Design a binder for these strands. Structure first.
Lengths: 215, 226
RNA sequence: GGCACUAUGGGCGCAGCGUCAAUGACGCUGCCGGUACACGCCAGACAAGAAACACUUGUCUGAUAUAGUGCC
């Protein structure tokens, strides 16, 4: 039916001068019609490799493509600062054409604990019938971080949204926001509003909370 | 350098509307190439969509677009097209056209890509944001720095711009990617870390501009004290 | 994949009609059956043509060719 391309790893944390190998695994024979691309944010993808192994004209020679059966790997021999981007494989052996899910190559750095803050809703917002509680994780590394909402020690589910900034240009930390959305009616049916954060730089999960109604 | 794909035609349309995207080619005669359309939903990866082969006009499609999209090419206008009919919100993405290289030089790789054109499918109507203080607190605030911010809530479509202090304050500001809420309106929030000794002494104002609704808003973020 | 047996008027029976289809199915009816070979012709596969498919051209293969079942 359709051919599946499955990439590996989906994100990768390396420092300059590393050997980086990205691998992508095909579900049927694609022969050698695999292409690799580099995409940077906001920008069109750029061709790096064609025919699974061939160096596209103008691309640095530190990029190489390899083939092994249905298992294709792009390896960047020596990482450069302009090479932190997202990379994609592609099969064009048959239609539909299929792209791997993507690999994001990111800046390694020392662990930085997320400095955490919780913000209760404005009385102005309650006039709108909705209430948002915001939990902020500031300047942390690595990106992986679990934010867990609790209202009176009861976890919430399906009523929060996250959003992460890209890796900061200067200290290459991340920052993340989590927004718990509630009706005002449900908001005042409770007192203790809490944010729980697990991160590699946190010895044990850190928790910030407030009680609804503090002057 | 001299090869160039210049896309146009994206925009905002209600679900079930249609849109004709265009990819004008320069630097080459379009008829001797396969032209592909690739799309990318916000935050997702690349998804091939439709392609057309040279000398025959043969067209191919992704199952997710089969029957609704039509890739075509006018060689007299040296331009490829993608008619999208009965559009659905899952179809929202940045739409790329790409050229399949010459077989001998770059295999079947797409060597040149258009600039991107944005397609938004939504039944939401335009709404300016409501701006809400993310006020800092009295507790903790023991790290020499405190954090404060603005909640930019319930707008459509993107984008807003958020400055602080009319652009004066930028160091340590984080403005997150907007998320689309289940209501189909968007929200982001802008936060800034500041010296915790300035809270009552220093005024912090977030300025939110939402061009589509012609709304500029300035919000003063004040402490609450006890 | 290998092994085993099993089946195949042009590899191209000669035709007709209904053909539906969307490229997935064809079929009945008639007609006549030296043999290879040479071709043609068609169909595969391969390359090349600005060329994934179609197209054009070249080369090759259709007897050790396609078609099943069992074994492994």
């Amino acid at each position: 039916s359709d051919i599946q391309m499955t990439q590996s790893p989906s994100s990768l944390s390396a420092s300059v001068g590393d050997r980086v190998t990205i691998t992508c695994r095909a579900s049927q024979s694609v022969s050698s019609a695999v292409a690799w691309y580099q995409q940077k944010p906001g920008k069109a993808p750029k061709l790096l490799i064609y025919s699974a192994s061939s160096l596209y004209s103008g691309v640095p020679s530190r990029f190489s493509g390899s083939r092994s059966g249905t298992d294709f790997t792009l390896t960047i021999s020596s990482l450069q600062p302009e090479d932190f981007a997202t990379y994609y494989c592609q099969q064009s052996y048959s239609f539909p054409s299929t792209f791997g899910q993507g690999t994001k190559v990111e800046i390694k750095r020392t662990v930085a604990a997320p400095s955490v803050f919780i913000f209760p809703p404005s009385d102005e917002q309650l006039k709108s019938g909705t209430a948002s509680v915001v939990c902020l994780l500031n300047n942390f590394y690595p990106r992986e971080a679990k934010v867990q909402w609790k209202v009176d020690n009861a976890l919430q589910s399906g009523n929060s949204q996250e959003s992460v900034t890209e890796q900061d240009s200067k200290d290459s930390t991340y920052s993340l926001s989590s927004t718990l959305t509630l009706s005002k009616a449900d908001y005042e049916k409770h007192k203790v509003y809490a944010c729980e954060v697990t991160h590699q730089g946190l010895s044990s999960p850190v928790t910030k909370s407030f009680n609804r109604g503090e002057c | 350098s001299e090869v160039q794909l210049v896309e146009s035609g994206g925009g905002l349309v209600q679900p079930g509307g249609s849109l004709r995207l265009s990819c004008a080619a320069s630097g080459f005669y379009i008829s001797y190439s396969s032209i592909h359309w690739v799309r990318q939903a916000p935050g997702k990866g690349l998804e091939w969509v439709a392609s057309i082969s040279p000398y025959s006009g043969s067209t191919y499609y992704a199952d997710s677009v089969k029957g609704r999209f039509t890739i075509s090419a006018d060689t007299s206008k040296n331009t490829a097209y993608l008619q999208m009919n009965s559009l659905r919100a899952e179809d929202t993405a940045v739409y790329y056209c790409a050229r399949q290289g010459y077989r001998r030089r770059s295999g079947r790789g797409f060597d040149y890509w258009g600039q991107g054109t944005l397609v938004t499918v939504s039944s939401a109507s335009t709404k300016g944001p409501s701006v809400f203080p993310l006020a800092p607190s009295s507790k903790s605030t023991s790290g020499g720095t405190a954090a404060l911010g603005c909640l930019v809530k319930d707008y459509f479509p993107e984008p807003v711009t958020v400055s602080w202090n009319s652009g004066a304050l930028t160091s340590g500001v984080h403005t997150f990617p907007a998320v689309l809420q289940s209501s189909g309106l968007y929200s982001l929030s802008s936060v800034v870390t500041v010296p915790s000794s300035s809270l009552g002494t220093q005024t912090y104002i977030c300025n939110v501009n939402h061009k589509p609704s012609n709304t500029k808003v300035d919000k003063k973020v004040e402490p609450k004290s006890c």
